[PDB]
Design a protein around this ligand. Structure first.
Ligand SMILES: Nc1ncnc2c1ncn2[C@@H]1O[C@H](COP(=O)(O)OP(=O)(O)OP(=O)(O)O)[C@@H](O)[C@H]1O
Ligand SMILES: Nc1ncnc2c1ncn2[C@@H]1O[C@H](COP(=O)(O)OP(=O)(O)OP(=O)(O)O)[C@@H](O)[C@H]1O
Ligand SMILES: Nc1ncnc2c1ncn2[C@@H]1O[C@H](COP(=O)(O)OP(=O)(O)OP(=O)(O)O)[C@@H](O)[C@H]1O
Ligand SMILES: Nc1ncnc2c1ncn2[C@@H]1O[C@H](COP(=O)(O)OP(=O)(O)OP(=O)(O)O)[C@@H](O)[C@H]1O
Ligand SMILES: Nc1ncnc2c1ncn2[C@@H]1O[C@H](COP(=O)(O)OP(=O)(O)OP(=O)(O)O)[C@@H](O)[C@H]1O
Ligand SMILES: [Mg+2]
Ligand SMILES: [Mg+2]
Ligand SMILES: [Mg+2]
Ligand SMILES: [Mg+2]
Ligand SMILES: [Mg+2]
Ligand SMILES: [Mg+2]
Ligand SMILES: [Mg+2]
Ligand SMILES: [Mg+2]
Lengths: 491, 74, 62, 506
């Protein structure tokens, strides 16, 4: 085998993308982390995918949790372990001590065990072996140097055996040492770390490959999600810039608007409707989702500010009936505070749902309500995650951003998303004659021509009604106009 | 190698010998050492630094979830 | 000899530029880092380039 | 000299200033720092100089490094220690451990070393001593208690002996405890701390005198660099304010300007060129180096923005042949990135280049260039640096500063240097009827009268053309002025109809 390293895909949504193939075959991989990070899971799900997808029996070796439990719990993600032990496809090599015992059994067992292991490997024709909490073994009475020899005995042995491994390790500080003894670190051929960061009293799981000896991989941390279908990792960086682009158009929900956009919104594209509070962003959304119910199509609306009931209300008041929109299963409303989770868990829910309603249009009721309380670098990511998804998926995306300051705002956006958006719809207030009148403007469209003037507009029970530009005013943008009343040419 | 049951001093002396004998042969040598914190001690045992004529550090500085790799000549 | 110190080339793009010539002849250079930072590679690339470019035999201790 | 302690000069660029004269005779200075900080060099240089300048022999006790190498390396700076060890001016005392050693030896040998050293000193009649890396010795199996009593013995006996010793020590962290066992700091008379602070991936070494029992010294950190000549320090605070002032005046390279400046710039003065990007500072600088050459006087240009090539390109297109300036041996362009080393370094190169060329004029295009990344305090300190040298050396200086916000900048400093400067030159944009015109201005001159006008200017292959002022404009400085007319048509040259000729004939 004089070839480049060989990797054996994991089938853990995303791991194979970050590891450019996955755990090098026949070698040991170390997945360490502070309690509650995934570990136990990761290895389980490691074996599983290996069996139910390539018929590569697995050897699981616990050092504390009783086999009966590894099963019990596994039922969490909808998979009966008891079945593969019955079909002899996975062997849970119980290695946890019993209630009673003795001591002074140091390297004593570390040896006998390498026999019971080689045992089941040969016996069950194993290929994927996972040992969870190897650490919970030396936590008997050892020091660094003692550990580095008991571990190295094993791996060295397993490599010989020809089995590809995954060792579990526990850490105390999320960013301190890689493993309880800073010894495993250099004893593994590839190291993986499960980080579960606090910050904001909210948590964010993150997986990383520190190293993979003999191959390239993806440097850095990646957010992952523990759900019902196991671990899931979105390689938001990995995602490529090869989205499909069409010159086909789609209505805005507002005719006169469509006209301004010179034909409408391209199907494959992202639209952003910015404007002070009140301007009516949520309006435009509402109307943009009905137009996808007239052409009998499925679209979704994610609201993080208003409720289910109130939305319906403020919707029946504008004419459009969502009640029906729901019955005719062509429209789906979500609703959830931004505080009920984190961008990682959100980016997913959006994705997930999107797969179970096969939308054609989609709008999020306020991104800025989603950036509420989270670092920019974190939000700017979340968007690139939903923005790209919808993109390489042919779904037209219109999002909502409520600028922090009404009138005079010097930026369609605060978090710095305009660069990410294709078409920009800017609603602003305009103080004329002591009154707060509106205005709508297609700030920019990347393909079309769109209307260059700032057209005023009012809101009635019939919905928006775009009007005429303030041709005779100045400083419109600022918000506080000034009439020219130019005395003609004065005759 | 020192990861068997040794302490700073013992380790300090040992590098001295090793390195030293190697000096005698006339062999230009490059030694690899493992750390713990990207900026913490230069070498695991807080000794290897002063004992070597030349010191090179490879940092895989994290930051913003992105890792940056640097190399320095103390 | 009776002059400054003599260096060897490592032919590692950049390094030999940083080190003002490369590692010093007849001495041990300590390259230390955390898990997955370069070391071994740097050690290997060191020997390799030695052979493949001046025909300088190399011994690697693992 | 008023101090109560007789000091001895190290002859190390800047130390004897910082240490108010040098190391106290008959005592011991603990020079310690992290790794790659300068320690041994400092000791080596210490012995050296006492030998090359006072004919004071000296003993050098090496603990880890080999007696061969200490000579091998010293050559780097151009020191033939072998020749000194030969002339018996420098005895090296090898106490390094063995590649085939046993284990156990750091106490009775300490009783032995004292006796050993007492022999060298007595035999070589030495007046200076340098024990390098005492630390390594205890580094066999010891704790703070055996370190305070064991050093002490050495020091003390050494003191009786009458030798002015220097001891080196290692220490893990750069700002934490001075030395390893955190004990060497109190047994010593003096403590010198060498650091190699990181910060922004670059590296800044500094030297500091925590304490000199009995005298006074300069407090806090002072930046030093290691060159082919050894350690070099900048007492950027021992830089007294006593430079010469002369009402002498010199050319700017622009004659209408010289007017604007009461009759040309002052010789002893600091000139500050500030303006938004693209206004023309760079230019004025050129015409400044040029003129200093058209008068047969030397001057150096340190560009941190443009290349030596491109600097010549735009210079020629503006007239002035820099190609010749170089050959005639009147002008010298340096050119370098600020990211090619921290301030401490830059500040020296500049000095370097000013002693190997002795210019009478010097230009630094874009101080605000050097301010990249660096913390104000560090920049402001460097600015006082260059500025301060050029001020005590009759070396007129033209610094260029580019303001980070064109039109609408409320301070032509950004870094707040407008107090170090003696005279400021102001360039900026003026939106006049949909056009981006420039205008200059002489904001301040300490001793002159200068022109208070905000004259507009235009650039040609020929240079900075100084025209007239926007008398008929309000909110000038604002970038986009307002037109308010009381006249304009007013005389100056009314007479209508056919006033001009054309190209045929006049
Ligand atoms: N059905 C589920 N839905 C959502 N999250 C789950 C589900 N099942 C488990 N989890 C999450 O995954 C974690 C389980 O961790 P697991 O037992 O796999 O190993 P670990 O956290 O790596 O190590 P340790 O044994 O110390 O807990 C729980 O802490 C929990 O947050
Ligand atoms: N029936 C109606 N008739 C006339 N105007 C209405 C009616 N309903 C709402 N409006 C107008 O629309 C605004 C309601 O805001 P809308 O639901 O469009 O979302 P928004 O302004 O984008 O965001 P947010 O509600 O979070 O501030 C009111 O401020 C009001 O001026
Ligand atoms: N062909 C390759 N291309 C790009 N990067 C690689 C390649 N092979 C390995 N790597 C990278 O190098 C790392 C492997 O570390 P390496 O074997 O070079 O020694 P080390 O990090 O100095 O010490 P250790 O034995 O602890 O890993 C991996 O983490 C990976 O990112
Ligand atoms: N000619 C030179 N020009 C510039 N730098 C030099 C020159 N010679 C040596 N150096 C630098 O000087 C330093 C040498 O440090 P030195 O051997 O004097 O003692 P140390 O760093 O204090 O202690 P240690 O024995 O633990 O290394 C190196 O960091 C090296 O980069
Ligand atoms: N040959 C030329 N003819 C006419 N005008 C020129 C010529 N060369 C340059 N200019 C003008 O001079 C300006 C160049 O500025 P200059 O090189 O003097 O330095 P600066 O504005 O101080 O700093 P920087 O150029 O680095 O921003 C241009 O913006 C342009 O209007
Ligand atoms: Mg576990
Ligand atoms: Mg390693
Ligand atoms: Mg709002
Ligand atoms: Mg809203
Ligand atoms: Mg290694
Ligand atoms: Mg050192
Ligand atoms: Mg030294
Ligand atoms: Mg310039």
């Amino acid at each position: 085998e004089h070839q480049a390293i060989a990797k054996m895909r994991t089938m853990i949504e995303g791991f194979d993308d970050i590891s450019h193939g996955g755990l090098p075959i026949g070698r040991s991989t170390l997945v360490s982390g502070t309690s509650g990070t995934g570990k136990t899971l990761f290895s389980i799900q490691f074996l599983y995918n290996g069996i139910i997808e390539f018929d590569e029996p697995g050897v699981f070796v616990t050092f504390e949790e009783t086999p009966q439990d590894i099963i019990k719990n596994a039922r969490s993600f909808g998979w009966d372990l008891a079945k593969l032990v019955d079909e002899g496809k996975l062997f849970i090599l119980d290695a946890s001590p019993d209630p009673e015992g003795q001591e002074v059994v140091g390297g004593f067992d570390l040896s006998a065990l390498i026999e019971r292991i080689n045992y089941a490997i040969q016996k069950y024709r194993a290929r994927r072996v996972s040992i969870d909490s190897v650490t919970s073994v030396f936590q008997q009475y050892d020091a660094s140097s003692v550990v580095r020899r008991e571990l190295f005995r094993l791996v060295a042995r397993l490599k010989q055996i020809g089995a590809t491994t995954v060792m579990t390790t526990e850490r105390i500080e999320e960013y301190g040492p890689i493993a309880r003894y800073g010894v495993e670190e250099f004893v593994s051929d590839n190291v993986v770390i499960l980080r579960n960061v606090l910050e904001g009293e909210r948590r964010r799981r993150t997986l990383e490959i520190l190293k993979l000896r003999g191959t390239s991989h993806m440097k850095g941390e990646y957010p992952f999600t523990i759900t019902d279908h196991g671990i899931n990792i979105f390689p938001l960086g990995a995602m490529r810039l090869t989205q499909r682009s069409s010159n086909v158009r789609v209505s805005s929900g507002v005719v006169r608007l469509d006209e301004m956009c010179g034909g409408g919104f391209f199907k494959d594209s992202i639209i952003l409707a910015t404007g002070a509070t009140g301007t009516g962003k949520t309006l435009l959304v509402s109307r943009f989702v009905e137009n996808a119910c007239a052409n009998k199509e499925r679209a979704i609306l994610f609201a993080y500010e208003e409720s289910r009931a109130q939305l319906l209300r403020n919707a029946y008041s504008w004419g459009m009936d969502f009640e029906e929109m729901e019955r005719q299963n062509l429209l789906k409303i979500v609703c959830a505070y931004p505080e009920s989770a984190g961008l990682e868990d959100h980016l997913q829910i959006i994705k997930s749902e999107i797969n179970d309603f096969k939308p054609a249009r989609i709008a999020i009721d306020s991104l800025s309500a989603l950036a509420r309380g989270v670092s920019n670098n974190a939000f700017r990511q979340f968007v690139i995650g939903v923005t790209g998804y919808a993109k390489q998926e042919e779904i037209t995306g219109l999002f909502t951003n409520t600028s922090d300051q009404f009138m005079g705002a010097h930026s369609i956006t605060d978090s710095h998303i305009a660069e990410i958006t294709d078409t920009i719809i800017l609603l602003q207030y305009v103080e004329i004659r002591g009154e707060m009148s509106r205005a709508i403007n297609v700030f920019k469209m990347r393909g079309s021509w769109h209307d260059k003037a700032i057209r005023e507009f009012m809101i009635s029970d019939k919905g928006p009604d775009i009007k005429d530009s303030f041709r005779n005013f100045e400083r419109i943008i600022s918000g506080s106009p000034t009439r020219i009343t130019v005395d003609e040419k004065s005759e």
